[PDB]
Amino acid sequence: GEPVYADAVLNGWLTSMGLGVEYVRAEGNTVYYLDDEGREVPVLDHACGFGSLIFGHNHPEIIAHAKAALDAGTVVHAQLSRQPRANQISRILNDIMRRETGRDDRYNAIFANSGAEANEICMKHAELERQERITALFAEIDAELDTAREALTTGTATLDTASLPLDVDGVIADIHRHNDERRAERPLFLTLDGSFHGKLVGSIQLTQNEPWRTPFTALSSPARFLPADEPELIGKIVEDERRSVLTLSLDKDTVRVVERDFPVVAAIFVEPVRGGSGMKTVTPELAEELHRLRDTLGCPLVVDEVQTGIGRTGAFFGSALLGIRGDYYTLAKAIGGGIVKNSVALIRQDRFLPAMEVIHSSTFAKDGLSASIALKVLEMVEADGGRVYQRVRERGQRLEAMLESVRADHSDVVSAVWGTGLMLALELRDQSNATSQAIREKAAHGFLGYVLAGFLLREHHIRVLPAGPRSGFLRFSPSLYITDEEIDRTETALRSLFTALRDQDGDRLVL
Amino acid sequence: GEPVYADAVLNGWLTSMGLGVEYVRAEGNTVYYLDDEGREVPVLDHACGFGSLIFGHNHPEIIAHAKAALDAGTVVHAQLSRQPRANQISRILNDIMRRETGRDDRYNAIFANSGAEANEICMKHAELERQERITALFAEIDAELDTAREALTTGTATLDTASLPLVDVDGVIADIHRHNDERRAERPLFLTLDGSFHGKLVGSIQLTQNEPWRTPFTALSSPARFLPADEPELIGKIVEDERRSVLTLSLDKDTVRVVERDFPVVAAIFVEPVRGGSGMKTVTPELAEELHRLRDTLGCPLVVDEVQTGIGRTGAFFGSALLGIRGDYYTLAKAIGGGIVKNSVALIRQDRFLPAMEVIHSSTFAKDGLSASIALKVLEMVEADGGRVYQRVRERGQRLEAMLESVRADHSDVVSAVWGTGLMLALELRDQSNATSQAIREKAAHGFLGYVLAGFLLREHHIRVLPAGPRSGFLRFSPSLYITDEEIDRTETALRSLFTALRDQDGDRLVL
Ligand SMILES: Cc1ncc(COP(=O)(O)O)c(C/N=C/c2cc(O)cc(-c3ccccn3)n2)c1O
Ligand SMILES: Cc1ncc(COP(=O)(O)O)c(C/N=C/c2cc(O)cc(-c3ccccn3)n2)c1O
């Protein structure tokens, strides 16, 4: 009953899952906690800051570079002065993308402090684009109404009355009123089912997970969550959302009131590999449908590489690997080197509105320190002729083969292996009908994966965290230094886990 | 015409203002740029990360502590495990706030990565509170409609038809549910002050007055009403305008009426104790009393934004404590990162705090080990030696404000006012849109005046100042507490020079 000032409920919940541990040190793929006697217990980390730690915890190169930057008196706060490192970082990211996509496009960079902030830069810029489109359409409609009013009040044409269900001055004023309502309406964003794009006031609307989002629905523009698995259905859902404004269309003799398209949709967002969905990679059929939508609606396709970028999938850009051709791109997580906080929106230069450079800002964004560490991380992942990507791919193959070998002998409790590169997952089969009460009850609160993670922690000293909407997936996203021995120990631990779960051993799995 | 990949327009604009410089090193209150010959020129920094650097650039204690944390293998990414430092930081902030307000309240802490993110945690939690209130009101209305439907369809009462302009028994109920459903889905409102700056993300930007920053984005997110800080008598009625109501059936034994009940529209009130976007104006006691009334009246939380005013800047830890603003949530950022890392925190009073927020809100980088460690260092430093660091802020602030007043006094033709408190201070410039010099007048008319004048101060006196306020009509002075008497003299000399040239309308000298 002692006063508590943070984290009571969070900690209460972690304890009950068997995840109530304090890690006191970390290096590479290992975090250490203290046992009863006060010695350090090594735990293998497969969570790794939800995929932030492509180079592991506290990589000596990154640590050394950070300490050097600090000792050089790097200018961290230099707001509203020249900061070339921002242009330098963007030049690198531009070259990488050209190399990997074969496209010779150019991107402007705006920096921020988290993946959510970078996605919301993209939301904001998208809505700057949508406002341009809207200004132009309405300028055109003014003119159409000017022209049709010259035709009607001087001779040449008559107002066809069949179209009035949609007096000259009254019809125009009615058209302006209708169009004004429409213009002030909140836009729509399009996302995939299971999408995770952040949990701030704007981005949370873009994140499916229902208990995270639905409390906050009234605050900000919504998204429509398109069904990734059935792209045939997306056409019509998006067709539903079409809205139109009104104008007067002259045809020499006849004037009609007619509907024109209003730009409702500010952006489409996609993750190349869909973390909130259990690490499912976007299929070629889904990519082609997102291209169609982007071409059809004329809004930007925003590719969220907060998790899939910086080498994780076996290239720098997961979008490049899977052939997703976005207009904006976002990066965060691994770009901070496992130690600092940084993110970036890349916005194609032929779409980029220059006002954004001067009307958007952030105190911490583009700071010297995280700029310097960015350039380090980019140097590291690019080094030795792109060998680091090769290494991610061969480590990933190894880890996925293990995981497949485990599914194969445990398909009664494991449905699928998902993902690519070193961004992988096991889908757990539903256990809401489980024989063991305690397991069944946990399945029914959506806590299953956390319980199973607890088992792995206490019995095998392996740190795994669940992914997906009801912790129905187990995440495996270690650093590229994950050893063959560490992968064996993980196989042994999972064979153990899923054998106990086959045996419905509730006493052993739930505390 | 070479390819450019960031910042072209930004840099183009800074150059034309005379602020096109790259600082290559920083220490204390000094940043250094390289001249033509490649030597380091010291420049005195009065901007200091817009008030992030209460202890100056790269303070050796903070740098050392950071390097130690890095060398110890501090766990930066430990998501969904026990992280006591968060509770530890919040305990310290709680004790400080008790000491300074005399109130024995307790606050839960949720961390984030920027001031905007911390304000948006508060926006989210406020809207959780509003949804509780809404659920309760609508449960009550269900029951009232149940009761009035028992009265009408069995005997006792009749539906008074004088009240039907607000909308058959079943039809009136279905009409009431429809009306109430529209209302329930409506976006909430936020209340802010004129000139408010609360961040520039999708949610927070609505809460930031500056019109070119915000109005492009109006359709995205819930809006605010910007209340006139200077005339609190006017706020009552603006907020009255925003009242909205739902419908119910009220039984009075014999008679049933359709009646309006209050709907909770307002999710939160936000306030800065010292209002940066307004030119560093401190909230008056009359305005504080009006914000209390609103908070008591509406039953939504008052969110006190100490992203800038907190961590000692005003001469206490909490500016709110100094000026008697009794908020329900508090936010901190800027100086808590020690000038080197990124961190922020929302403190939400524990008797309002909804426990779901602890498990439905999260962030990858939030609550990381490194910025946690550096937070505890900063808090140790500002608290050290029996609260002497606050004393030092106050005496350095008095010194700097006295200089600035002395300068206004002999230059009241171009300076209207000194504003602010502690080491968060500003000069208000007089309008120059009627200036004799064409070049000055034109700059005044794009709202660039303060930036031009900052450029003068940079190139002619080697002093870094940045403007505040809606059309760069204020000059900010927010240095570290180590600002020396000599550095203050050099600033007086530089400003006397600046405002004498501006008196002389010397456009050639001020504008490039
Ligand atoms: C694809 C993608 N896009 C934007 C973001 C948002 O970035 P920030 O967190 O830096 O704002 C994330 C960050 N991912 C966070 C994450 C990923 C995950 O697999 C689980 C949880 C989690 C699960 C339960 C409770 C709290 N957090 N969080 C992301 O994965
Ligand atoms: C009171 C208050 N609340 C929340 C915030 C937002 O915090 P973050 O910037 O960390 O998101 C700030 C950050 N203030 C930044 C600032 C303060 C200022 O006086 C001028 C400019 C500025 C002016 C021009 C262009 C870009 N930035 N920026 C603040 O001052």
Short mmCIF file of N, CA, C and O and ligand atoms in Angstrom, two decimals, chain A residues 10 13 49-52 113-119 195-200 203 207 209 212 269-279 304-308 330-333 341-343 423 450 465-468 475 477, chain B residues 79-80 113 117 358-366, ligand 1:
data_model
loop_
_atom_site.label_atom_id
_atom_site.label_comp_id
_atom_site.label_asym_id
_atom_site.label_seq_id
_atom_site.Cartn_x
_atom_site.Cartn_y
_atom_site.Cartn_z
N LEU A 10 0.92 -1.24 -14.97
CA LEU A 10 1.78 -1.86 -15.95
C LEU A 10 2.59 -2.97 -15.30
O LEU A 10 2.61 -4.09 -15.80
N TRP A 13 0.57 -5.96 -14.16
CA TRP A 13 0.22 -6.80 -15.27
C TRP A 13 1.43 -7.66 -15.77
O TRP A 13 1.30 -8.85 -15.96
N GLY A 49 13.98 -3.88 -28.61
CA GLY A 49 13.31 -2.60 -28.81
C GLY A 49 12.28 -2.63 -29.95
O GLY A 49 12.17 -1.65 -30.72
N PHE A 50 11.54 -3.74 -30.05
CA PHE A 50 10.60 -3.94 -31.15
C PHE A 50 11.29 -3.72 -32.53
O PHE A 50 10.70 -3.15 -33.45
N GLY A 51 12.53 -4.18 -32.66
CA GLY A 51 13.22 -4.12 -33.96
C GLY A 51 14.06 -2.86 -34.14
O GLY A 51 14.61 -2.63 -35.20
N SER A 52 14.30 -2.18 -33.03
CA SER A 52 15.20 -1.02 -33.03
C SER A 52 16.69 -1.40 -33.14
O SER A 52 17.50 -0.59 -33.47
N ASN A 113 11.30 13.02 -33.92
CA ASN A 113 11.83 12.41 -32.66
C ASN A 113 11.26 11.01 -32.37
O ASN A 113 11.70 10.34 -31.49
N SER A 114 10.28 10.60 -33.15
CA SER A 114 9.74 9.29 -33.03
C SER A 114 9.08 8.90 -34.33
O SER A 114 8.86 9.75 -35.19
N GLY A 115 8.76 7.61 -34.47
CA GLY A 115 8.17 7.10 -35.66
C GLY A 115 6.80 7.68 -35.88
O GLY A 115 6.41 7.99 -37.03
N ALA A 116 6.07 7.87 -34.79
CA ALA A 116 4.79 8.51 -34.85
C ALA A 116 4.91 9.95 -35.35
O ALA A 116 4.07 10.41 -36.14
N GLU A 117 5.90 10.68 -34.85
CA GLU A 117 6.08 12.08 -35.28
C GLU A 117 6.36 12.16 -36.82
O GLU A 117 5.99 13.16 -37.48
N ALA A 118 7.07 11.14 -37.34
CA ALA A 118 7.49 11.14 -38.76
C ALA A 118 6.29 10.82 -39.65
O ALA A 118 6.06 11.48 -40.63
N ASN A 119 5.47 9.90 -39.20
CA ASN A 119 4.22 9.61 -39.85
C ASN A 119 3.27 10.77 -39.83
O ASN A 119 2.61 11.02 -40.80
N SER A 195 -2.91 -2.44 -39.05
CA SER A 195 -1.88 -1.41 -39.24
C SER A 195 -1.45 -0.84 -37.90
O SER A 195 -2.25 -0.72 -36.99
N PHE A 196 -0.15 -0.63 -37.75
CA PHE A 196 0.38 0.12 -36.64
C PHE A 196 1.23 1.26 -37.18
O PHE A 196 2.23 1.03 -37.84
N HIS A 197 0.80 2.49 -36.93
CA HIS A 197 1.50 3.67 -37.44
C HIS A 197 1.85 4.70 -36.33
O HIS A 197 2.26 5.85 -36.62
N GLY A 198 1.69 4.28 -35.06
CA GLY A 198 1.91 5.18 -33.92
C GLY A 198 0.66 5.40 -33.09
O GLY A 198 -0.48 5.00 -33.48
N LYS A 199 0.84 6.06 -31.94
CA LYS A 199 -0.22 6.17 -30.96
C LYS A 199 -0.36 7.60 -30.42
O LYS A 199 -0.94 7.80 -29.34
N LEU A 200 -0.01 8.58 -31.24
CA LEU A 200 -0.34 9.98 -30.93
C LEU A 200 -1.74 10.34 -31.46
O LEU A 200 -2.46 9.49 -31.96
N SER A 203 -1.94 9.83 -35.34
CA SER A 203 -1.51 8.53 -35.81
C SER A 203 -2.31 7.40 -35.20
O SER A 203 -2.42 6.32 -35.79
N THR A 207 -4.05 3.38 -36.39
CA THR A 207 -3.62 2.14 -35.78
C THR A 207 -4.85 1.31 -35.41
O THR A 207 -5.74 1.78 -34.69
N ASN A 209 -5.49 -1.70 -33.73
CA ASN A 209 -5.71 -2.26 -32.38
C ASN A 209 -6.78 -1.51 -31.62
O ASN A 209 -6.62 -0.33 -31.30
N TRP A 212 -6.62 0.40 -28.14
CA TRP A 212 -5.67 1.54 -28.20
C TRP A 212 -6.29 2.76 -28.86
O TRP A 212 -5.98 3.92 -28.48
N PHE A 269 -1.50 4.84 -46.13
CA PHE A 269 -0.29 4.34 -45.37
C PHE A 269 -0.14 2.84 -45.54
O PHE A 269 -1.11 2.11 -45.42
N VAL A 270 1.11 2.37 -45.67
CA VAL A 270 1.38 0.94 -45.69
C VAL A 270 2.68 0.59 -45.00
O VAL A 270 3.70 1.26 -45.18
N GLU A 271 2.68 -0.53 -44.28
CA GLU A 271 3.90 -1.15 -43.82
C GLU A 271 4.27 -2.27 -44.75
O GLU A 271 3.51 -3.19 -44.90
N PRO A 272 5.52 -2.29 -45.20
CA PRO A 272 5.98 -3.38 -46.08
C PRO A 272 5.87 -4.74 -45.41
O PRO A 272 5.69 -5.77 -46.10
N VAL A 273 6.19 -4.78 -44.13
CA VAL A 273 5.93 -5.93 -43.30
C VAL A 273 5.14 -5.47 -42.11
O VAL A 273 5.49 -4.48 -41.46
N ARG A 274 4.02 -6.12 -41.86
CA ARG A 274 2.94 -5.52 -41.11
C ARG A 274 2.95 -6.02 -39.66
O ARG A 274 2.29 -7.01 -39.32
N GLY A 275 3.70 -5.31 -38.80
CA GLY A 275 3.97 -5.77 -37.42
C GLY A 275 2.72 -6.04 -36.63
O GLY A 275 2.55 -7.15 -36.10
N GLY A 276 1.78 -5.10 -36.67
CA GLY A 276 0.53 -5.25 -35.93
C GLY A 276 -0.34 -6.41 -36.43
O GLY A 276 -1.44 -6.64 -35.89
N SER A 277 0.07 -7.03 -37.52
CA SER A 277 -0.70 -8.12 -38.14
C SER A 277 0.01 -9.44 -37.93
O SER A 277 -0.38 -10.43 -38.49
N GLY A 278 1.12 -9.41 -37.18
CA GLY A 278 1.94 -10.59 -36.97
C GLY A 278 3.02 -10.79 -38.03
O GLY A 278 3.34 -11.90 -38.38
N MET A 279 3.56 -9.67 -38.54
CA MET A 279 4.76 -9.70 -39.41
C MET A 279 4.46 -10.22 -40.84
O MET A 279 5.33 -10.75 -41.50
N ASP A 304 5.53 3.27 -44.54
CA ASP A 304 6.00 3.36 -43.12
C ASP A 304 7.06 2.30 -42.88
O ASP A 304 6.75 1.09 -42.80
N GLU A 305 8.32 2.72 -42.90
CA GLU A 305 9.44 1.82 -42.71
C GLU A 305 10.08 2.05 -41.34
O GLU A 305 11.28 1.72 -41.11
N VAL A 306 9.29 2.57 -40.40
CA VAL A 306 9.76 2.75 -39.04
C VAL A 306 10.38 1.45 -38.47
O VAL A 306 11.41 1.48 -37.79
N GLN A 307 9.79 0.30 -38.84
CA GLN A 307 10.25 -1.00 -38.36
C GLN A 307 11.04 -1.77 -39.43
O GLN A 307 12.05 -2.38 -39.13
N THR A 308 10.56 -1.72 -40.70
CA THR A 308 11.14 -2.55 -41.77
C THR A 308 12.44 -1.99 -42.35
O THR A 308 13.13 -2.67 -43.09
N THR A 330 8.93 6.85 -44.27
CA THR A 330 9.32 7.19 -42.92
C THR A 330 10.20 6.21 -42.34
O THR A 330 10.04 4.99 -42.55
N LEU A 331 11.14 6.69 -41.55
CA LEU A 331 12.09 5.84 -40.86
C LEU A 331 12.18 6.28 -39.40
O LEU A 331 12.07 7.44 -39.10
N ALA A 332 12.45 5.35 -38.51
CA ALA A 332 12.81 5.69 -37.12
C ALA A 332 13.59 4.51 -36.46
O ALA A 332 14.59 4.07 -36.98
N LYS A 333 13.11 4.05 -35.32
CA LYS A 333 13.72 2.95 -34.59
C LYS A 333 15.28 2.83 -34.72
O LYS A 333 16.01 3.49 -33.97
N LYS A 341 17.14 9.08 -30.12
CA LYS A 341 15.78 9.13 -30.68
C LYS A 341 15.76 10.03 -31.87
O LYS A 341 16.16 11.21 -31.77
N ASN A 342 15.38 9.49 -33.01
CA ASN A 342 15.44 10.21 -34.29
C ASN A 342 14.46 9.58 -35.25
O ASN A 342 14.09 8.40 -35.10
N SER A 343 13.95 10.37 -36.18
CA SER A 343 13.15 9.82 -37.29
C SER A 343 13.12 10.77 -38.44
O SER A 343 13.62 11.90 -38.34
N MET A 423 12.93 -10.00 -39.44
CA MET A 423 11.66 -9.57 -38.89
C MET A 423 10.63 -10.65 -39.05
O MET A 423 9.94 -10.70 -40.05
N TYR A 450 1.78 -13.39 -24.09
CA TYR A 450 2.53 -12.85 -22.96
C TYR A 450 2.85 -13.91 -21.93
O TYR A 450 3.95 -13.95 -21.38
N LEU A 465 8.68 -11.10 -26.98
CA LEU A 465 7.41 -10.41 -26.76
C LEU A 465 6.45 -10.71 -27.87
O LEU A 465 6.85 -11.06 -28.97
N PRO A 466 5.16 -10.69 -27.54
CA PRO A 466 4.17 -10.98 -28.54
C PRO A 466 3.96 -9.83 -29.50
O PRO A 466 4.33 -8.70 -29.21
N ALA A 467 3.50 -10.15 -30.71
CA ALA A 467 2.93 -9.17 -31.61
C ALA A 467 1.43 -9.44 -31.85
O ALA A 467 0.91 -10.54 -31.55
N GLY A 468 0.78 -8.51 -32.53
CA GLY A 468 -0.52 -8.76 -33.12
C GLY A 468 -1.63 -8.49 -32.13
O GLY A 468 -1.37 -8.28 -30.93
N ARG A 475 7.10 -12.66 -31.53
CA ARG A 475 8.00 -11.89 -32.37
C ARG A 475 9.42 -12.44 -32.26
O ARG A 475 9.90 -12.74 -31.15
N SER A 477 12.88 -10.77 -33.60
CA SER A 477 13.57 -9.70 -34.33
C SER A 477 14.88 -9.32 -33.65
O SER A 477 15.05 -8.19 -33.22
N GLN B 79 11.58 -2.40 -23.27
CA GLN B 79 10.13 -2.23 -23.32
C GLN B 79 9.46 -3.42 -22.69
O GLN B 79 9.87 -4.55 -22.89
N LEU B 80 8.39 -3.15 -21.95
CA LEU B 80 7.59 -4.19 -21.29
C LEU B 80 8.44 -5.02 -20.36
O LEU B 80 8.39 -6.27 -20.37
N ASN B 113 8.68 11.62 -25.80
CA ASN B 113 9.94 11.97 -26.50
C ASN B 113 10.02 13.45 -26.92
O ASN B 113 11.06 13.91 -27.37
N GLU B 117 4.50 15.49 -27.73
CA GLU B 117 4.02 14.15 -27.39
C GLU B 117 3.43 14.14 -25.96
O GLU B 117 2.49 13.35 -25.66
N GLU B 358 -2.18 3.44 -18.78
CA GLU B 358 -0.85 2.83 -18.56
C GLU B 358 -0.58 1.68 -19.53
O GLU B 358 0.57 1.27 -19.70
N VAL B 359 -1.66 1.05 -20.02
CA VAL B 359 -1.50 -0.14 -20.88
C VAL B 359 -1.97 0.07 -22.32
O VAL B 359 -1.62 -0.72 -23.18
N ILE B 360 -2.78 1.10 -22.58
CA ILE B 360 -3.18 1.37 -23.96
C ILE B 360 -2.34 2.45 -24.64
O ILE B 360 -2.30 2.51 -25.85
N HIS B 361 -1.65 3.27 -23.86
CA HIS B 361 -0.64 4.17 -24.42
C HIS B 361 0.77 3.60 -24.30
O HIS B 361 1.14 3.08 -23.29
N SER B 362 1.58 3.81 -25.34
CA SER B 362 2.99 3.43 -25.30
C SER B 362 3.76 4.14 -26.46
O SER B 362 3.17 4.79 -27.28
N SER B 363 5.08 4.00 -26.45
CA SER B 363 5.94 4.57 -27.46
C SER B 363 7.25 3.78 -27.43
O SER B 363 7.70 3.36 -26.36
N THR B 364 7.83 3.52 -28.59
CA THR B 364 9.05 2.71 -28.65
C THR B 364 10.16 3.32 -27.80
O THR B 364 10.69 2.68 -26.92
N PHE B 365 10.40 4.61 -27.99
CA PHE B 365 11.57 5.28 -27.41
C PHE B 365 11.28 5.79 -25.97
O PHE B 365 12.18 6.14 -25.25
N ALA B 366 10.01 5.89 -25.61
CA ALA B 366 9.63 6.52 -24.35
C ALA B 366 10.15 5.73 -23.20
O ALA B 366 10.10 4.48 -23.21
C1 LIG C 1 5.55 -0.07 -37.92
C2 LIG C 1 5.57 1.02 -36.90
N1 LIG C 1 5.21 2.27 -37.25
C3 LIG C 1 5.26 3.26 -36.37
C4 LIG C 1 5.70 3.02 -35.07
C5 LIG C 1 5.67 4.17 -34.06
O1 LIG C 1 7.01 4.59 -33.74
P1 LIG C 1 7.29 5.26 -32.29
O2 LIG C 1 6.89 4.26 -31.24
O3 LIG C 1 8.79 5.60 -32.20
O4 LIG C 1 6.47 6.52 -32.15
C6 LIG C 1 6.04 1.72 -34.70
C7 LIG C 1 6.51 1.40 -33.31
N2 LIG C 1 6.18 0.02 -32.93
C8 LIG C 1 5.87 -0.16 -31.71
C9 LIG C 1 5.42 -1.48 -31.18
C10 LIG C 1 5.52 -2.63 -31.96
C11 LIG C 1 5.03 -3.83 -31.45
O5 LIG C 1 5.20 -4.98 -32.15
C12 LIG C 1 4.39 -3.85 -30.18
C13 LIG C 1 4.28 -2.66 -29.44
C14 LIG C 1 3.58 -2.63 -28.09
C15 LIG C 1 2.77 -3.69 -27.68
C16 LIG C 1 2.08 -3.61 -26.48
C17 LIG C 1 2.21 -2.47 -25.69
C18 LIG C 1 3.02 -1.44 -26.12
N3 LIG C 1 3.68 -1.52 -27.31
N4 LIG C 1 4.79 -1.51 -29.96
C19 LIG C 1 6.00 0.73 -35.64
O6 LIG C 1 6.31 -0.58 -35.30
#
